[PDB]
Design a protein around this ligand. Structure first.
Ligand SMILES: [Mg+2]
Ligand SMILES: [Mg+2]
Ligand SMILES: [Mg+2]
Ligand SMILES: [Mg+2]
Lengths: 149, 120, 57, 241
RNA sequence: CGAGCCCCGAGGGGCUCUCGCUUCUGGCGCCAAGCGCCCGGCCGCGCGCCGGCCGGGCGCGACCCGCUCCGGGGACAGUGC
RNA sequence: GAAAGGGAGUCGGGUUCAGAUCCCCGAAUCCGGAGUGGCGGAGAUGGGCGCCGCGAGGCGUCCAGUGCGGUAACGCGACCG
């Protein structure tokens, strides 16, 4: 509730103790239940995999990009949005990417991201058509909607 | 070659806690039980409803201390009337007192128990 | 029944005489048996394949 | 030959994504308590920063052998404890009752302790040797003592541990001890120790005054710098010749 | 294992990615197998590393060393006047 | 932090001037306890070989025995952990 992007509940194995770790990835469009996703440096280029930007080619596009090397995803999280890996330089370990706003950002090559575009498509294409539909939209978000000039 | 830390968390080590061994009791003597059985049972009720309970339900009606529970009422009646009781029902009256309906064992007669108490 | 009623039911009333009985369905139990066996067979196949492939320097 | 065929090796490989990792040593990766972190970081800071020579001189402690001979000598002059002081006082009282009298009987030489007592002895040039602990935590009580001893001409040495000096004086901790006059049978051993200590400390005070300490980077930083230097050196070697 | 980097006598050290075990399946995966070294009790060859049976401990398995947990900034930011 | 959310398990009849799913009568039910183990039932009590014995059946020895049925869905009173 409150976001247009579907969430993906993904279960991993704990590498250090006998337990199952459940994550709440942002669903890249095209992923389905029962699909294996792979996260790490040696993961392959497939929709839903998480791997550092520095290991990705010069034109790939990504879904849940890290602003800093080590936090979780921060960029291109809203539905339908994506970032593009423009360029690299192996020295200084930097990668230039294009954000959904069109701005250009230099980030560390160790920042991870999900391959693909986030699901939720062109949600803004449909006209809302109704003050009631807008009311139900913002009731799940916050108290901001009926806006007095 | 054996001391190892297999967890990345430092927990506070367990240190033994001695039990108190005071050099003097803080109170010289234990305070006596103010809620003895004479304090628990104040006086029996002798109203028409109480007499009906005595002669019909084999039940003695008492006015008891508000802080006494069913177990204490049962033991108090058992001690200071030398009778066996089946059960105790308890209410608190609108005037603030506590009223106990004590149903006696079948082999005990509430009528002649009330006679020897003196509430006929 | 309601969850706290299961405490006073006998064991038989709360499960089925089968592996994962009372926790997993028969169809998906069969699927898991077949999946386990076939994946272990595939592991054997790839092990044999690399063992015969390493024969040449 | 009689081995049970049912026995077999069951090796687990600990590769990524395979069988879970064994419980190995993680001491380097422990979330330590704040006081442990603070003391370790203080130790690291004392190597990062440029330590002035007045503080760095206390890192020059006596070697283990020389410290052993010094403490072995100093054990013969430990201050008398409470029990044996009581015994000596009772003996003096009994002797005065019958029948000698005053009888000072040559109050023996003793090891003088305490920074104030040692400082006064050094200022009066009465001390023959001064021993200073290297780990006085409020390090202002003894920072002047090397310089003062050098100026007044009394030999001074720095020894590891104030706890050892405390055990010498039957206490927990002593900053400094002082050798005043000593018995004749130990004069030679004291002379040998004084000669060695004067060679090691007083005679090279001029560059003790200038030997700054610390200013050492971490092993990771040093390794990274050395890697860069080797990276440029491997191509400079091919450039030359 | 590896391309074999380069000496090659075809050995092999200085020299590079590897100083890696997991990608066709909506399974499973922890609380060590194995090896080595010891310490007890038992009956007992009754000549000692010695016959075998019931327990216990350590090490390798799971390399060594090290000074900041790891990463990102950094004498800027920030804070005080 | 809820007498409207979650939350095991009480119903029928009678009875007072005024109380009842609370009292009385009669039928149940939940939770907790049983250390000295309350009674049963289950586990669990079968085969092989030597013998005796007319047969049946008894003696000795050895070996099993942490239940059973249905192709299956699942079932049976328990069914070590
Ligand atoms: Mg408006
Ligand atoms: Mg009540
Ligand atoms: Mg509460
Ligand atoms: Mg009413």
């Amino acid at each position: 509730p409150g976001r247009g992007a579907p969430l993906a509940k993904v279960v991993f194995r704990d590498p250090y103790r006998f337990k199952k770790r459940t994550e709440l990835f942002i669903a890249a469009e095209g992923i389905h239940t029962g699909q294996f996703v792979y996260c790490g440096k040696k993961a392959q280029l497939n929709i839903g995999n998480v791997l550092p930007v520095g290991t990705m080619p010069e034109g790939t596009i990504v879904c849940c990009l890290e602003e800093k090397p080590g936090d979780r995803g921060k960029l291109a999280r809203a539905s339908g949005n994506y970032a593009t890996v423009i360029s690299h330089n192996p020295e200084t370990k930097k990668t230039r990417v294009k954000l959904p706003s069109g701005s250009k950002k230099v980030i560390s090559s160790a920042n991870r991201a999900v391959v693909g575009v986030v699901a939720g498509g062109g949600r803004i294409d449909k006209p809302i058509l109704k003050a009631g539909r807008a009311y139900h939209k913002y009731k799940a978000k916050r108290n901001c909607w009926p806006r007095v000039r | 070659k054996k001391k190892i830390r297999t967890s990345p968390t430092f927990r506070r080590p367990k240190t033994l806690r001695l039990r108190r061994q005071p050099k003097y009791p803080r109170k010289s003597a234990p305070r006596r039980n103010k809620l003895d059985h004479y304090a628990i049972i104040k006086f029996p009720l002798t109203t028409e409803s109480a007499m009906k309970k005595i002669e019909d339900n084999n039940t003695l009606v008492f006015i008891v201390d508000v802080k006494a529970n069913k177990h204490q009422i049962k033991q108090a009646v058992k001690k200071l009337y030398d009778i066996d009781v089946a059960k105790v029902n308890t209410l608190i009256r609108p005037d603030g007192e506590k009223k106990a309906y004590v149903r006696l064992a079948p082999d005990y007669d509430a009528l002649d128990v009330a006679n020897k108490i003196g509430i006929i | 029944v309601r969850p706290k009623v299961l405490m006073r039911l006998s064991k038989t009333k709360k499960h089925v005489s089968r592996a994962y009985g009372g926790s997993m369905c028969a169809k998906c139990v069969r699927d898991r048996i077949k999946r386990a066996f076939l994946i272990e067979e595939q592991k054997i196949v790839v092990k044999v394949l690399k063992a015969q492939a390493q024969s040449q320097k | 030959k009689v081995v049970n065929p049912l026995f077999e090796k069951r090796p687990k490989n600990f590769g990524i994504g395979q069988d879970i990792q064994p419980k190995r040593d993680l001491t380097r990766f422990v979330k330590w308590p704040r006081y442990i972190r603070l003391q370790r970081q203080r130790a690291i800071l004392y190597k990062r920063l440029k330590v002035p020579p007045a503080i760095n001189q206390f890192t020059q402690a006596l070697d283990r052998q020389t410290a052993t001979q010094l403490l072995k000598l100093a054990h013969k002059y430990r201050p008398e404890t409470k029990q044996e002081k009581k015994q000596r006082l009772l003996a003096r009282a009994e002797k005065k009752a019958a029948g000698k009298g005053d009888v000072p009987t040559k109050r023996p030489p003793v090891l003088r302790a305490g920074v104030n007592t040692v400082t006064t002895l050094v200022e009066n040039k009465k001390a023959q040797l001064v021993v200073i602990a290297h780990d006085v935590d409020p390090i202002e009580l003894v920072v002047f003592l090397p310089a003062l001893c050098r100026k007044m001409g009394v030999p001074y040495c720095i020894i590891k541990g104030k706890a050892r000096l405390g055990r010498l004086v039957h206490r927990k901790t002593c900053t400094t001890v002082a050798f005043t006059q000593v018995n004749s049978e130990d004069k030679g051993a004291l002379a040998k120790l004084v000669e060695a200590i004067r060679t090691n400390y007083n005679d090279r005070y001029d560059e003790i005054r200038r030997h700054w300490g610390g200013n050492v980077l971490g092993p990771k930083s040093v390794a990274r710098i050395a890697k860069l230097e080797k990276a440029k050196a491997k191509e400079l070697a091919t450039k030359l010749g």
